[PDB]
Design an enzyme around this catalytic site. Structure first.
Site, PDB file in Angstrom:
ATOM      1  N   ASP A  89      70.910  51.848  41.035  1.00 21.09           N
ATOM      2  CA  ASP A  89      70.119  51.660  42.258  1.00 21.09           C
ATOM      3  C   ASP A  89      69.417  52.968  42.623  1.00 21.09           C
ATOM      4  O   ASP A  89      69.830  53.705  43.521  1.00 21.09           O
ATOM      5  CB  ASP A  89      70.999  51.162  43.401  1.00 21.09           C
ATOM      6  CG  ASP A  89      70.190  50.734  44.632  1.00 21.09           C
ATOM      7  OD1 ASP A  89      68.945  50.656  44.549  1.00 21.09           O
ATOM      8  OD2 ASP A  89      70.804  50.463  45.688  1.00 21.09           O
ATOM      9  N   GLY A 182      68.826  50.718  57.260  1.00 15.26           N
ATOM     10  CA  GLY A 182      67.761  51.636  57.597  1.00 15.26           C
ATOM     11  C   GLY A 182      67.992  53.047  57.107  1.00 15.26           C
ATOM     12  O   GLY A 182      67.086  53.884  57.222  1.00 15.26           O
TER      13      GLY A 182
END
Lengths: 234, 34
Positions: A89, A182
């Site tokens: 990732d 976020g």
């Protein structure tokens, strides 16, 4: 970031902010023209013309005088990144350059972070300050978190078999301090507490189960594990 | 229900607008599920 404090103005010159559509992510400036973020931030493959990178920010989505807004000319996700397991990732953003090969103007507020070659680590980001929060943080938040070993994070009541090679865990098993939604793409930087000689980027904020909850520490992409991939594609 | 919920900030109206095991929470943002 849950359970953090306001970041000092000059303590985070490497953090990048990524704005597009109705999404938000962060990243780390690792060279004047290159930002390192999470691959799942670009999971839907947004066009590079749609992305906006901002460097030098203290407050989220704020146009400050030392702030620098750059376009993204291209990006590359690590191959075999899975939107199911979230192995591999990480992604690289190539910023727009001028005629003289210059992208970011290095300044006291805009500086690359060292890559890896008794350790304290901090996580930083503008994400939710509580799990399920209604609103991003305005001021950048910073929180100190410790490394957690592989076998403690792979325990069945922690993250079990979901912890894959190239991932890393940090935080407290009892909870209270973590990254949150976020914060993805943002940095986990570490420095040796016995000498305090260099700040190094050790992790990329990736995923978790809730935020700051018991037996659910944050999971990070292991930057040192992908050192060769970062060097080859920059 | 546990699982992998990535920590991207994203507005949503359906669960399908969210990655991995995240769902659309009552705040209209993606977040961990049940």
């Amino acid at each position: 970031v849950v359970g953090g404090l306001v970041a000092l103005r000059g303590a985070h010159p490497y953090i990048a902010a990524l704005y597009w559509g109705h999404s938000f992510c962060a990243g780390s400036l690792i060279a004047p023209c290159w930002v390192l973020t999470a691959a799942h931030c670009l999971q839907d493959r947004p066009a590079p013309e749609d992305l906006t990178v901002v460097l030098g920010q203290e407050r989220r989505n704020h146009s400050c005088e030392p702030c620098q807004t750059l376009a993204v000319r291209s990006y590359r996700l690590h191959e075999a990144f899975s939107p199911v397991s979230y192995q591999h990732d990480l992604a690289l953003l190539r910023l727009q350059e001028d005629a003289d090969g210059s992208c970011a103007l290095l300044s006291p507020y805009v500086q690359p972070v060292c890559l890896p070659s008794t350790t304290l680590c901090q996580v930083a980001g503008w994400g939710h300050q509580f799990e399920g929060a209604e609103e991003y943080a305005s001021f950048l938040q910073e929180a100190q978190v410790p490394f957690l070993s592989l076998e403690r994070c792979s325990a069945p009541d922690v993250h079990g078999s979901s912890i894959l090679p190239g991932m890393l865990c940090a935080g407290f098993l009892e909870g209270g301090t973590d990254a949150c939604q976020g914060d993805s793409g943002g940095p986990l930087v570490c420095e040796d507490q016995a000498a305090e000689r260099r700040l190094t980027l050790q992790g990329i904020i990736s995923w978790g189960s809730g935020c700051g909850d018991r037996n659910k520490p944050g999971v990070y992409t292991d930057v040192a594990y992908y050192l060769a991939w970062i060097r080859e594609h920059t | 229900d546990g699982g992998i919920c990535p920590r991207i900030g994203r507005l949503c109206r359906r669960d399908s607008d969210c990655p991995g095991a995240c769902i659309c929470r009552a705040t209209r943002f993606c977040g961990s599920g049940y």
